[PDB]
């Protein structure tokens, strides 16, 4: 999937390429979605890969990236739900699990990169 409906920061794009991800940028209505396909998860969830998604807000990167999304929905392998992961958001007719994880945003340093860094740190936290 090489869909690229909009550009990100050049540094964002250099990073995703260096990381080797299979990433696409999709316009859904007026929603700008970055979607990383086949995102490898840490052991401990019902699934081992997911689609990791970020809503690129209007005014980014001065506006903040607020949360991260994952499809298929994720649960601990033991079955216990992950706190603050109940809401779902339609992405091109796909119900993504919305992880309610919030931080402070600094436009001088915060980008897709650091928001992807938070997302991973949260995924590591909820299995350990």
């Amino acid at each position: 999937a090489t869909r690229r409906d909009f550009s990100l920061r050049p540094e964002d794009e250099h990073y995703l390429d260096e990381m080797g991800y299979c990433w696409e940028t999709r316009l859904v209505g007026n929603a700008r979605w970055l979607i990383i396909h086949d995102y490898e998860l840490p052991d401990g969830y019902n699934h081992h890969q997911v689609n990791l998604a970020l809503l690129i807000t209007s005014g980014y990167p001065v506006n903040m990236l607020d949360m991260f999304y994952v499809y298929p929905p994720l649960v601990r392998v033991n079955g216990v739900n992950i706190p603050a992961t109940e809401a779902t958001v339609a992405i091109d007719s796909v119900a993504y699990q919305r992880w309610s994880r919030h931080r402070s945003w600094n436009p001088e340093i915060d980008s897709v990169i650091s928001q992807l860094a938070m997302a991973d740190g949260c995924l590591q936290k909820e299995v350990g």
Partner: protein, 453 residues
């Protein structure tokens, strides 16, 4: 007419550094080099980005009428300007005479300008400064003299306009009109406040007036928008078209340039980047953010104005007016930004751009706070604020106050509290502004949404 004259803009900080190096006190000529970006819009704008100072010690000769300095600093400048084809401007003290020596040959001023072009395929220039700060510059095209800079300017605590055709004119005088007649003003938002700002700018004699707004006249805003009419409301007339036609009728000339679009667009930005002053009169955080990015990227002084009538509800009486306030913020290139002053924040912009259903659900989760309820805007408060906003610009172009203009960088008045306050530029904390004088470096304004393909 006087809306296509090229420009050379320095920041206050850079000009202060330059002036010091060029007038150390020994009375002898000194040398320095400006490396400038460019915005080649309606008019050519040279945006001073980097400053190389030629140390007196390295010079072979320094006299009150002449100076000879080594060409290794001309090679440093070319190396800095090679990547982006930046423009190089040589600066020398009032007399200006100089040569550039290598170890094998000397170069006159004309031969040094040819050397810069051979190094960078771009426009280059040569300037001169006098003791008081004023500057004059000549642009050399293809290594050979061509045109002179119509305007060299520094928008600092005071705003400086150094004209080629040039005591200072006092305020509210013909000389003021003549300065305005050569300038371009951008009104972002033709709103309750914006339309009042636009009226003042038109009747004050500004030579070019950009009007940026996507909204239309309505029966609701017929109580606030200057020159609007019942007919315009019943026909849902674009605000910029309405006001562009009013200016044409008032000024008898097509000086207005209507932009029917949001400021958050390539069209509005690249048009606003030609202005000599920005008047932000939109009441959204994102709009104020876009306007503040333009000001720093294109070295344009910005005046941002706001009004608010917060309301509460007493259980004994009912809805009451909490306060009646206004705010004027002046932002000089290189000084504290609207971001520094928290006029907008990432959090503030996020909540605003949430959908209607997104806002409510986030509010239920308690991660976002609710917005403050306010009364309907009124023409009088808008008028109080807009008069102060434009008066701020006059005071900075033609000082008439009994205190330094720096004391009134921010202004906050209160009609209900009957109180007015001021903040000094020196009490505001500034964050690093790497986007200063970058111009239209893509992505435009640093925002991927505003980028080209």
């Amino acid at each position: 007419n006087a809306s296509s004259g090229n420009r050379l803009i320095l920041t206050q900080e850079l000009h202060t550094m330059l002036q010091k190096h060029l007038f150390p006190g020994d009375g002898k000529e000194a040398a320095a080099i400006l490396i400038c970006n460019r915005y080649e819009g309606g008019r050519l704008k040279l945006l001073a980005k980097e400053l190389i100072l030629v140390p007196y010690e390295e010079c072979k000769s320094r006299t009150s009428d002449f100076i000879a300095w080594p060409g290794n600093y001309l090679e440093k400048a070319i190396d800095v300007a090679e990547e982006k084809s930046m423009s190089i401007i040589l600066i020398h003290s009032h007399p200006g005479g100089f040569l550039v020596f290598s170890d094998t040959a000397d170069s006159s001023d004309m031969q040094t300008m040819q050397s810069l072009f051979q190094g960078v395929d771009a426009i280059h220039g040569s300037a001169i400064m006098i003791h008081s700060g004023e500057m004059r510059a000549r642009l050399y095209r293809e290594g050979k003299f061509a045109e002179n800079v119509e305007l060299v300017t520094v928008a600092g605590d005071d705003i400086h306009y150094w004209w080629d055709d040039k005591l200072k004119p006092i305020a509210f005088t013909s000389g003021m009109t003549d300065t305005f007649q050569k300038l371009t003003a951008a009104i972002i938002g033709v709103s309750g406040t914006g339309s009042i700002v636009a009226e003042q700018v038109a009747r004050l004699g500004f030579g070019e007036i950009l009007l940026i707004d996507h909204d239309h006249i309505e029966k609701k805003n017929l109580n606030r928008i200057l020159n609007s009419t019942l007919k315009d409301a019943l026909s849902h007339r674009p605000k910029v078209d309405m006001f562009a036609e009013a200016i044409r009728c008032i000024r008898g000339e097509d000086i207005s340039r209507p932009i029917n679009n949001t400021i958050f667009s390539r069209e509005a930005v690249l048009a606003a980047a030609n202005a000599d002053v920005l008047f932000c009169c939109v009441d959204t955080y994102l709009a104020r953010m876009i306007a503040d990015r333009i000001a720093s990227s294109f070295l344009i002084p910005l005046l941002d104005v706001g009004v608010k009538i917060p309301t509460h509800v007493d259980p004994d009486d009912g809805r009451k007016i909490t306060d009646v306030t206004g705010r004027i913020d002046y932002v000089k290139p290189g000084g504290s930004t609207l971001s520094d002053r928290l006029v907008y924040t990432p959090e503030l912009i996020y909540r605003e751009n949430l959908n209607a259903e997104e806002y409510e659900e986030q509010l239920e989760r308690g991660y976002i706070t609710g917005v403050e309820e306010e009364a309907p805007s009124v023409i009088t408060l808008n008028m109080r604020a807009a008069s102060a906003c434009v008066s701020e610009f006059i005071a900075r172009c033609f000082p008439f106050r009994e205190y330094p203009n720096k004391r009134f960088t921010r202004t906050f008045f209160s009609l209900a509290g009957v109180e007015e306050d001021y903040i000094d530029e020196s009490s505001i904390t500034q964050a690093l502004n790497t986007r200063l004088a970058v111009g239209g470096e893509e992505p435009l304004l640093g925002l991927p949404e505003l980028g080209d393909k």
